[PDB]
Amino acid sequence: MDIVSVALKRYSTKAFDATKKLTAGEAEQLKTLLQYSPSSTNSQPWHFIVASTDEGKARVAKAASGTYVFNERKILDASHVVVFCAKTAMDDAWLQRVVDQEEADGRFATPDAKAANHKGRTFFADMHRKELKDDDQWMAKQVYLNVGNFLLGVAAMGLDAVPIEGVDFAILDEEFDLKAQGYTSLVVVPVGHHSAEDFNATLPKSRLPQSTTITEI
Amino acid sequence: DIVSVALKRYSTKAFDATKKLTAGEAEQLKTLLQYSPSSTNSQPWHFIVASTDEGKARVAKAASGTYVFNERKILDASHVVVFCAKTAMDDAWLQRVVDQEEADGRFATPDAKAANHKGRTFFADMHRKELKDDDQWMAKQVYLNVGNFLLGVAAMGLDAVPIEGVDFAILDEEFDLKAQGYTSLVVVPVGHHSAEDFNATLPKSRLPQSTTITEI
Numbered sequence: 001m002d003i004v005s006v007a008l009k010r011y012s013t014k015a016f017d018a019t020k021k022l023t024a025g026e027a028e029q030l031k032t033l034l035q036y037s038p039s040s041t042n043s044q045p046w047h048f049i050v051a052s053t054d055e056g057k058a059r060v061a062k063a064a065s066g067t068y069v070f071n072e073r074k075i076l077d078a079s080h081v082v083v084f085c086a087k088t089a090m091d092d093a094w095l096q097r098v099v100d101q102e103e104a105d106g107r108f109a110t111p112d113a114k115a116a117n118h119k120g121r122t123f124f125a126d127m128h129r130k131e132l133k134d135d136d137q138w139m140a141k142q143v144y145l146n147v148g149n150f151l152l153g154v155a156a157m158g159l160d161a162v163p164i165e166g167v168d169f170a171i172l173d174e175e176f177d178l179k180a181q182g183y184t185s186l187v188v189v190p191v192g193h194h195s196a197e198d199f200n201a202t203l204p205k206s207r208l209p210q211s212t213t214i215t216e217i
Numbered sequence: 218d219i220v221s222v223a224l225k226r227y228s229t230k231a232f233d234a235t236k237k238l239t240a241g242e243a244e245q246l247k248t249l250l251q252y253s254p255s256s257t258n259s260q261p262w263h264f265i266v267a268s269t270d271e272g273k274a275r276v277a278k279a280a281s282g283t284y285v286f287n288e289r290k291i292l293d294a295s296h297v298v299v300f301c302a303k304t305a306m307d308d309a310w311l312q313r314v315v316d317q318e319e320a321d322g323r324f325a326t327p328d329a330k331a332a333n334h335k336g337r338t339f340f341a342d343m344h345r346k347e348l349k350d351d352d353q354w355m356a357k358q359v360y361l362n363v364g365n366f367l368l369g370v371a372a373m374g375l376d377a378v379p380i381e382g383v384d385f386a387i388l389d390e391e392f393d394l395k396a397q398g399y400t401s402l403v404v405v406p407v408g409h410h411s412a413e414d415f416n417a418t419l420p421k422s423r424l425p426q427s428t429t430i431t432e433i
């Protein structure tokens with residue numbers, strides 16, 4: 001697969017064609033990509049809101065009013081809009097949920113194997129939630145890893161997307177009652193097909209030279 | 218078929234030290250690191266790419282104490298990437314990014330460049346002046362790069378594993394990162410898994426979508 005060509009062709013969509021929708025199969029693949037991203041210890045400390053109705057997208061778009069109005073149209077016009085959310089705390093129940101799911105999927109040959117996995121994950125989680133008091137940051141980082149996986153994955157599907165931090169995430173959290181549910185919103189990714197007006201699709205891609213960013217040893 | 222790639226890649230537990238990347242694959246690895254997106258194209262990152270035994274040994278110093286279980290992966294993989302974030306978003310870096318965008322022909326006019334610079338500075342100021350979280354903001358962009366990278370190398374047919382289980386203070390000291398304005402965050406060995414790594418064969422486990430996805 002020519003993934004480098006995918007990486008060089010994908011770009012941050014500036015306008016979506018509001019008439020072009022994902023197929024049913026594409027929508028399923030989108031959710032599979034969200035689900036199957038890796039994460040530290042397979043902790044999966046995340047929730048996703050996938051908005052595909054006009055009202056659902058309008059609820060997300062409420063967070064882009066005023067200061068962030070330049071991002072509001074992207075949210076309204078795309079086919080499917082993903083709100084990436086992190087857990088606000090790594091609680092005991094979630095750690096148990098993850099390891100129980102690994103058992104349900106047949107990853108452990110014995111109780112001892114499950115216990116070793118649980119102990120190892122709990123060690124890392126405790127380092128963050130007890131020692132460093134940064135489990136919120138640790139989990140948010142895993143969500144961003146998922147975003148990076150997602151942007152390349154949808155590009156490889158032939159879909160356009162744009163990662164969006166330019167919204168009011170406090171408004172978004174309130175609109176979707178996220179804090180009470182144990183989550184906080186971090187990134188919005190509209191997905192679809194760019195419009196004929198979006199000339200960012202052809203503008204040269206710009207990055208700092210490797211002589212600046214890469215040291216080879 | 219990127220979904221098949223996503224379902225086949227896995228966290229490699231042991232690498233075959235005899236299986237090196239080709240020269241072309243090594244170039245593609247660096248292209249993937251360079252061309253990841255980031256908020257405002259801020260690219261707030263540096264990468265150490267170790268491909269010699271001496272270079273991998275420097276990285277492996279961090280896989281000590283509790284983290285010895287990750288030492289072999291770092292030594293045995295063909296190429297090992299240390300992902301680093303800037304620790305502060307300074308004016309000079311913002312100017313460097315926008316000057317590079319001009320050099321690449323993204324702006325029709327000085328006015329267009331000025332608008333781009335103003336918009337990026339607005340976001341940077343929100344983090345570095347208002348929220349005082351620019352370090353966290355930049356680290357998040359590095360993790361986005363990691364996620365792009367893991368899927369990209371998988372699509373190239375390469376094995377990899379993201380590693381947080383090392384002592385990043387040792388890694389920072391070894392590479393003098395803090396005084397240069399950087400901190401190391403993730404180590405990703407890349408290569409081909411050992412035939413003895415049966416984690417390649419075990420079922421992939423994730424929470425059901427009924428738990429993690431709300432459709433609206």
Ligand SMILES: Cc1cc2nc3c(=O)[nH]c(=O)nc-3n(C[C@H](O)[C@H](O)[C@H](O)COP(=O)(O)O)c2cc1C
Pocket residue numbers: 010011012013014071162163164165166167187205253254255256257258259361
């Ligand atoms: C986390 C993140 C947030 C971003 N926020 C926005 C945004 O709010 N609106 C927007 O139009 N583009 C946004 N961008 C797109 C970036 O400007 C873009 O990724 C960068 O300029 C690199 O160019 P490319 O994505 O076209 O390769 C965001 C990108 C990332 C990764």
Ligand SMILES: Cc1cc2nc3c(=O)[nH]c(=O)nc-3n(C[C@H](O)[C@H](O)[C@H](O)COP(=O)(O)O)c2cc1C
Pocket residue numbers: 037038039040041042043145226227228229230287378379380381382383403421
């Ligand atoms: C940021 C990050 C850090 C990780 N740390 C380690 C590590 O130190 N050592 C390791 O063997 N695996 C590590 N893992 C691998 C995870 O356990 C793995 O991604 C998770 O179990 C999901 O399964 P999969 O990657 O096989 O699909 C890490 C993964 C991520 C994303």
